[PDB]
Design a protein around this nucleic acid. Structure first.
Ligand SMILES: [Mg+2]
Ligand SMILES: [Mg+2]
Ligand SMILES: [Mg+2]
Ligand SMILES: [Mg+2]
Ligand SMILES: [Mg+2]
Ligand SMILES: [Mg+2]
Ligand SMILES: [Mg+2]
Ligand SMILES: [Mg+2]
Ligand SMILES: [Mg+2]
Lengths: 55, 141, 361, 42, 122, 222, 110, 256
RNA sequence: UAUACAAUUAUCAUAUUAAAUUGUUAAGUGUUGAUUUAACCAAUAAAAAUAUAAAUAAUUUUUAUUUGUUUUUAAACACCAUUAGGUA
RNA sequence: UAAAUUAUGGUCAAUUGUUAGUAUUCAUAUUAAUUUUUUUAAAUGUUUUAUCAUUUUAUAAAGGUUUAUUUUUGAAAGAUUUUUUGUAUAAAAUUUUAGGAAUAGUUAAUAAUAAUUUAUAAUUUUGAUUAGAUUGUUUUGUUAAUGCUAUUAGAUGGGUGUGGAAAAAUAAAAAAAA
């Protein structure tokens, strides 16, 4: 591992690699991999009545 | 149980069952019953790495009988080719031919086992014989 | 007072409770984050109709009579007189099938007994759990394709719909047991599966389940992001019914396919066979289209009746063609996307565009 | 060392290491998989 | 090597795509979500990515949630190089929903994610 | 592994859905009261084991002697035929079944489920007693043994007992699976398999047996 | 929880060390955590997150011109309406009103 | 400046001109997007086209699905009439009377000499074709044109029992025109486009009314929904407007 | 400066197949007084017991839901301050 | 669910640090490089022609681009006279930054329309747009090896629009009509 990519430590490199790992990719189940936490608890106090046009 | 974890194959687990039941010196193992698994069993029983085996047309399982010699197993090591089912390793005829050669002497010691385009489970030596490439399963000696 | 202010003294583990306070009792969400304050009038009606009692439909008495006319003939002789041989057994193939009296006691078995006993096994005497099982069995029977069927999508969907309603009202009363919040959400997810499989199995039962129990809320695609990627429709590909439709009864297959050797689309071969597959239109599309059809009448009338205004505008267009950025139409001028293919112009040279991408690609 | 790299208990069978390499980048270039879109070596 | 090249013989790569129709807000334009494949030779394994296309369907046959076959063609407008070649699977359900005057599919409950906290009550 | 709750180790030779025994959420083990007869408390109970030792007995076939009539008149109950044997048998485990954690662990405390151990109370046999004889008299049930006609259990048993599994895994030496065999290092077993015809050899199968017999007999290590 | 359980890596021992943290190491980091928390207490720190604002960016309320401890440092610029409201919140947090849930009070909170 | 420099819709080569012309000699202008405007937009429909010899002679009799009383169709067409007449009352001679509404399943020329033999035979073969077919529930929405915008009609959407209809029609087609040689205006191996003719311009009218129904009238009803109808009754009819207030009917078959 | 983790068992912070939730009981007055504490000081002192079965396994909850901070002392113990109270 | 032979075939995979209780790819090793050394470049005036003109002579200045760059024969080749043909501008995939939020002469239909045509429009958390860095998809080094680690350079808007094609304002080492 060339020492100039990402942080000044090694583990920083592998921590960015995990954003490129094949089995780790974003999808309908695993989403918002890179910031999960900025979006957390965001709609708790947002009250949205669900959609019904059918009785 | 979760994402990062490996996705297991009834080959992976076949191998680790046999490994572990060889370590505890058991005479019988119950083992997952799919196609390439009992294929692998027949191949191993050909090469005399296993005392015998049977499929009862039980759906889940069939059973292998282990062989011991001079106080320890007949199996040094047995390892699956792939940790996942999401990874599929392809063996060129030349590679399988390399395995056979130990610095100029023909060496059949170790056995490697393949699927073929034809759905047969073979060792690498027959494969090399007819020059077919196949998908890797496991290696045992 | 204006917006919620959290206040956090950094030595303390967590902030102070914010601002004019959030509503004292936490809202009850569905699986998707939507909020229900209470059951809908319809669901409410389902619970009131479970509570006071249920009934076997004489649908079953009917089919019992037409299927096994002999047995129903025997019972027909024997009314009111105590029976030692249960002729009625065909009517109740399953233990679960008899819900009118407790512990699965068929009505006609109660003939020769005391009426105290008759009041002892009656509906009014059921526990609540028993009554739920009653509603469940009756519905499971309405949508079952044979008697012992459970696994089928329809049956599953109904049972899960009911269970979900029960848990819902339960949570309405006693607010915090998060065990059942969680069990509710899981039930809801499994209901979502059952329904989205139903509409590709047969859609009318799907419809009337939704109209009976009022669950349209768990069929609503959760969020725009994953919907836009076609992973809401992607579901029934996984479930394997994606091709299941069997066209020929609906939607004549002749105009659905393009021509392979010709290269003409399905709109084309449909055109040629003189057929129209056109989805029903809302007001937008009917209006846009109807406004488009008439461009040539309008134009014709314009250039006949009023040649001057026309000629002015034409002067504009004509001279314009000679002014402007490009006159020549080459690979540069004729770039369908200018800002995208030259991004390297965008900051310094070309000031028209603020961004390199206005569309999918 | 909780904070530090995972180590193998024993080595890896080298033979097997060569067997997993069949579809790797070099063998791909030799198969001619990637498209030659630019001038390349002179 | 994915499904698409499995079913089709393509004259040029990406000349054929199978997908689902997501949204029709534009007359004679069907948006289609479609998967393609990427290979990581280091890990010897594949991933499916997804991509949207604008398809030109003359005559508005498509409803949201149709499984369609899609082809490369004449440049039609700025972004549309694909046209709807064939409907593999129509939406029977969605069409019936339309006939009755309702939208083909219920609109998604939440929009895109936010870094804010929206306090909106009743 | 030194972590508590990871002590049960890695066993592959279990029947559970994980090879890591400590993630398995089904059966929590009990280190204090368990493992009298199985050795360690981690290891699977005798009736659940999927791997078998050389000089140890394997699982008894369940019945649920009439069928031995052709055998030695003296022969007692074959050691592997069991009246009551359950592969699914819940063994009482305190941390599961009697769980004292939310208490101060004083004498009566802890939560117990009674659905594990079979009831020794008198209440059951009193409450349910009836003039109508039991299930077996009434022959309520369909089916029977799930494998249909079974020589040990349903139908009569003829010929020989094989208590080691020697014939039960052998390899057919023949295209027809008529002649099967089992080989050791220096020994060779050739077993004629034709139970339907009373072991009468067909023309082909005999001309075959002459091949197997002398192939095995002219072998180098036999 | 918002704040951090630990400061630095408190479980560092050799693999299979059969505890989260040794006595020595945890003691070191309890020293570190102690100094930080003491700094927060004496400088009378205050933070806030506001609704309809980027949340991870927290206004430093202890640095506002009114509530500022230092008589020297220029505090910070926060909008006049939002600042008035923040001041009113910090102020009305202090004391226990009967009927409200009792919440822990300190010198340094004011 | 408000869009693409050369709008893609404006890029047009005319290959029906000539190789050297448009570079040097002269430039040819046209409004080319009237011609390109497609079959969905214009409302055209490709009907089975007649061979010339058959094209010469008038049609006499046709097959029709008879619409019951109390239709959704008839009602909505009546509303459509009212709206149309309030917009333009020049339509008044074009429009068909709501009493004459019927579905046209195919059109045919019968010579007047062999007339009785042919009606008997037809009626018989027709009764045999539809013996097994139970009533048909069909959907009507959308408009379309025959004969260069002279005939304006309501489409039959292939969303419903229509499928059966197509087999059914294609049977009589192979009997009536295939078996006993009869002039069906098309080829008996091709299927007719079923339709409800709403407005029409006949040869005599064409002088006062104009050569094509102006699309401004029916533009807004072009995609309008006329609804579902179940049909039990098939007719073979000779064309006379007078006799019943309906077309003179030479034969009938009941679907049940 | 470039130059090859693990995949059988690894302790600090990215959870996930789960059966809970709800129960109105107890305790209190005779009399002239050194109890508790290593030791001080305020000063009535007695007390709050019951539930199992059942809920099916997995596949698109990750902007949702969830991990010992809680109205009412005119009820105490307890704890903190010291005779004034706080808190419970 | 049987073995195999008419016997080495189908052409080489092979790992080299003297450490300091133990856990963890980390100082001193070799190979490759920079430290390191004038044996491969070069100077100005392009050239004909019918004369103040007209024919021939089309990608090395800088700016910093990651959903990005794409095209013809009408020039020459080119053969006998004159007409003579059609094929092209479009796409698909691969796209960086430790701690991540909105972007905008704007989509689609109409059409050689509309600085106010019509519409429930387009891009984004499957990570956009700005901003940082950076010359994109046969080139290297190390290695037994899935890897790790390089690869130069070259297309920077329009405004009498010439020319087949803008590649058109020093910086060749391309014989440019005897
Ligand atoms: Mg583009
Ligand atoms: Mg810029
Ligand atoms: Mg973690
Ligand atoms: Mg209180
Ligand atoms: Mg340059
Ligand atoms: Mg940039
Ligand atoms: Mg691209
Ligand atoms: Mg392009
Ligand atoms: Mg310029």
């Amino acid at each position: 591992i060339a020492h100039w990519y990402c942080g000044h430590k090694f583990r920083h490199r592998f921590m960015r690699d995990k954003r490129f790992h094949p089995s780790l990719q974003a999808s309908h189940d695993a989403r918002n991999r890179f910031s999960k936490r900025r979006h957390f608890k965001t709609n708790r106090w947002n009250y949205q009545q669900a959609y019904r046009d059918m009785p | 149980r979760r994402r990062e974890e490996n996705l297991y194959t009834p080959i992976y687990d076949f191998c680790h069952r046999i490994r572990e039941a060889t370590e505890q010196r058991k005479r019988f193992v119950v083992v997952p019953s799919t196609i390439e698994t009992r294929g692998c069993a027949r191949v191993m029983h050909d090469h005399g790495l296993v005392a015998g085996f049977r499929d009862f047309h039980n759906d889940r399982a069939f059973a292998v009988e282990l062989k011991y010699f001079q106080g320890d197993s007949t199996i040094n090591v047995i390892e699956p080719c792939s940790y996942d089912g999401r990874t599929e390793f392809e063996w060129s005829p030349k590679m399988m031919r390399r395995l056979l050669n130990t610095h100029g002497i023909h060496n059949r010691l170790v056995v490697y086992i393949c699927r073929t385009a034809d759905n047969r489970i073979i060792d690498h030596i027959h494969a090399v014989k007819e020059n077919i490439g196949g998908r890797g399963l496991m290696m045992v000696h | 007072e204006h917006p919620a202010i959290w206040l956090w003294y950094p030595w303390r583990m967590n902030p102070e409770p914010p601002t004019p306070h959030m509503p004292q009792r936490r809202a009850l969400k569905n699986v998707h984050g939507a909020v229900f304050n209470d059951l809908t009038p319809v669901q409410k009606k389902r619970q009131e109709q479970m509570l006071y009692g249920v009934n076997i439909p004489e649908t079953r008495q009917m089919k019992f009579e037409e299927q096994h006319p002999l047995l129903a003939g025997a019972l027909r002789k024997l009314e009111g007189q105590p029976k030692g041989f249960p002729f009625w057994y065909r009517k109740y193939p399953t233990r679960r099938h008899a819900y009118e009296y407790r512990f699965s006691i068929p009505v006609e078995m109660l003939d020769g007994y005391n009426d105290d006993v008759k009041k002892a096994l009656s509906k009014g005497m059921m526990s609540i759990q028993e009554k739920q099982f009653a509603q469940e069995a009756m519905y499971m029977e309405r949508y079952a394709e044979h008697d012992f069927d459970t696994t089928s999508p329809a049956v599953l969907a109904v049972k899960r719909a009911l269970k979900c309603r029960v848990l819902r009202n339960h949570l309405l009363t006693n607010p915090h047991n998060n065990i059942i919040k969680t069990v509710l959400a899981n039930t809801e997810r499994k209901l979502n599966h059952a329904l989205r499989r139903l509409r590709k199995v047969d859609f009318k039962k799907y419809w009337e389940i939704i109209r009976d129990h009022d669950v349209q809320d768990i069929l609503q695609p959760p969020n725009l992001v994953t919907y836009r990627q076609g992973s809401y429709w992607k579901y029934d590909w996984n479930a394997g019914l994606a091709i299941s439709t069997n066209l020929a009864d609906v939607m004549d297959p002749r105009g659905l396919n393009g021509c392979v050797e010709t290269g003409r689309s399905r709109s084309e071969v449909a055109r040629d066979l003189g057929l129209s597959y056109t989805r029903p239109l809302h007001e937008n599309e009917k209006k846009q289209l109807s406004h488009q059809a008439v461009y040539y009448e309008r134009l014709a009338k314009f250039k006949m009746e009023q040649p001057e205004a026309a000629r002015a505008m034409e002067r504009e267009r004509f001279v314009r063609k000679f002014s402007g950025m490009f006159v020549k139409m080459d690979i540069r001028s004729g770039a369908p996307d200018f800002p995208s293919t030259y991004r390297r112009l965008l900051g310094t040279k070309v000031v028209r565009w603020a961004s390199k991408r206005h569309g999918p690609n | 060392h909780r904070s530090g790299k995972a180590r193998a208990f024993v080595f890896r069978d080298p033979s097997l290491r060569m067997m997993r390499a069949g579809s790797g980048y070099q063998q791909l270039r030799r198969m001619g998989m990637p498209m030659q879109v630019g001038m390349g070596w002179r | 090597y994915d499904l698409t090249s499995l079913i089709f013989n393509q004259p040029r790569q990406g000349s054929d795509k199978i997908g689902y129709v997501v949204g029709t807000s534009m007359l004679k334009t069907a948006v289609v979500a479609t998967n393609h494949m990427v290979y990581y030779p280091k890990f010897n394994q594949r991933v499916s990515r997804t991509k949207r296309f604008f398809a030109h369907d003359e005559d508005l046959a498509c409803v949201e949630g149709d499984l369609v076959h899609i082809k490369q063609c004449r440049k039609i407008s700025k972004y549309k190089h694909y046209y709807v070649f064939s409907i593999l699977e129509p939406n029977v359900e969605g069409r019936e929903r339309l006939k009755l005057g309702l939208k083909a599919v219920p609109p998604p409950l939440f929009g895109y994610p936010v870094s804010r906290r929206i306090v909106k009550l009743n | 592994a030194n972590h508590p709750n990871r002590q049960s180790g890695i066993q592959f030779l279990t029947h559970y859905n994980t090879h890591q025994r400590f993630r398995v959420n089904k059966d929590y083990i009990d280190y204090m009261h368990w493992g009298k007869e199985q050795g360690q408390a981690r290891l699977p109970h005798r009736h659940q084991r999927v791997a078998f030792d050389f000089n140890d007995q394997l699982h008894p076939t369940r019945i649920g002697y009439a069928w031995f009539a052709s055998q030695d008149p003296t022969f007692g109950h074959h050691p592997d035929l069991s009246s009551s044997f359950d592969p699914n048998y819940r063994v009482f485990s305190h941390p599961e079944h009697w769980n004292k954690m939310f208490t101060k662990r004083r004498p009566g405390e802890g939560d117990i489920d009674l659905s594990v151990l079979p009831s020794r109370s008198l209440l059951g046999p009193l409450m349910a007693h009836s003039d109508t004889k039991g299930i077996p008299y009434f022959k309520v049930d369909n089916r029977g043994h799930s494998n249909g006609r079974v020589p040990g259990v349903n139908a009569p048993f003829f010929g020989e007992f094989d208590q080691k599994m020697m014939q039960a895994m052998s390899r057919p030496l023949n295209a027809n699976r008529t002649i099967t065999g089992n080989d050791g290092r220096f020994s060779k077993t050739i077993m004629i398999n034709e139970p339907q015809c009373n072991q009468a050899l067909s023309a082909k199968t005999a001309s075959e047996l002459s091949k197997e017999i002398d192939k095995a007999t002219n072998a180098v290590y036999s | 929880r918002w704040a951090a359980k630990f400061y630095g890596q408190v479980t560092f021992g050799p693999r299979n060390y059969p505890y989260p943290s040794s006595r020595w190491l945890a003691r070191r980091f309890q020293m570190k955590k102690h100094r930080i928390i003491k700094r927060f207490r004496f400088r009378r720190y205050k933070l806030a997150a506001v609704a309809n604002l980027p949340f991870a960016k927290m206004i430093r309320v202890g640095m506002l011109p009114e509530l500022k401890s230092s008589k020297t440092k220029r505090g910070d610029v926060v909008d006049p309406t939002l600042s008035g409201q923040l001041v009113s919140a910090v102020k009305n947090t202090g004391e226990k009103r009967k009927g409200q849930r009792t919440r822990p009070k300190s010198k340094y909170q004011v | 400046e408000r869009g693409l420099y050369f709008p893609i819709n404006h890029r047009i080569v005319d290959h029906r001109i000539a190789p050297g012309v448009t570079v040097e000699e002269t430039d040819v202008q046209s409004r080319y997007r009237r011609e390109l405007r497609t079959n969905f937009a214009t409302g055209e429909t490709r009907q089975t086209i007649a061979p010339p010899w058959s094209a010469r002679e008038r049609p006499t009799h046709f097959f029709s699905l008879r619409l019951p009383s109390r239709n959704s169709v008839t009602l909505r067409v009546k509303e459509m009439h009212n709206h149309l007449l309030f917009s333009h009352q020049q339509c008044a001679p074009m429009l068909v009377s709501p009493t004459k509404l019927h579905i046209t399943l195919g059109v045919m020329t019968i010579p007047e000499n062999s007339r009785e033999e042919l009606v008997k035979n037809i009626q018989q073969s027709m009764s045999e074709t539809f013996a097994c077919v139970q009533p048909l529930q069909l959907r009507f929405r959308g408009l379309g044109t025959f004969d260069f915008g002279r005939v304006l009609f309501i489409r039959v959407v292939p969303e419903a029992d229509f499928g059966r209809l197509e087999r059914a029609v294609c049977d009589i087609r192979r009997r009536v025109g295939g078996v006993l040689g009869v002039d069906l205006k098309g080829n008996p191996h091709d299927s007719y486009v079923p339709h409800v003719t709403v407005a029409k311009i006949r040869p005599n009218q064409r002088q006062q009314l104009g050569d094509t129904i102006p699309q401004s009238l029916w533009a807004d009803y072009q995609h309008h929904d006329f609804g579902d109808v179940t049909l039990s009754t098939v007719d073979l009819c000779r064309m006379k407007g007078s006799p019943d207030g309906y077309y003179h009917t030479e034969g009938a078959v009941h679907l049940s």
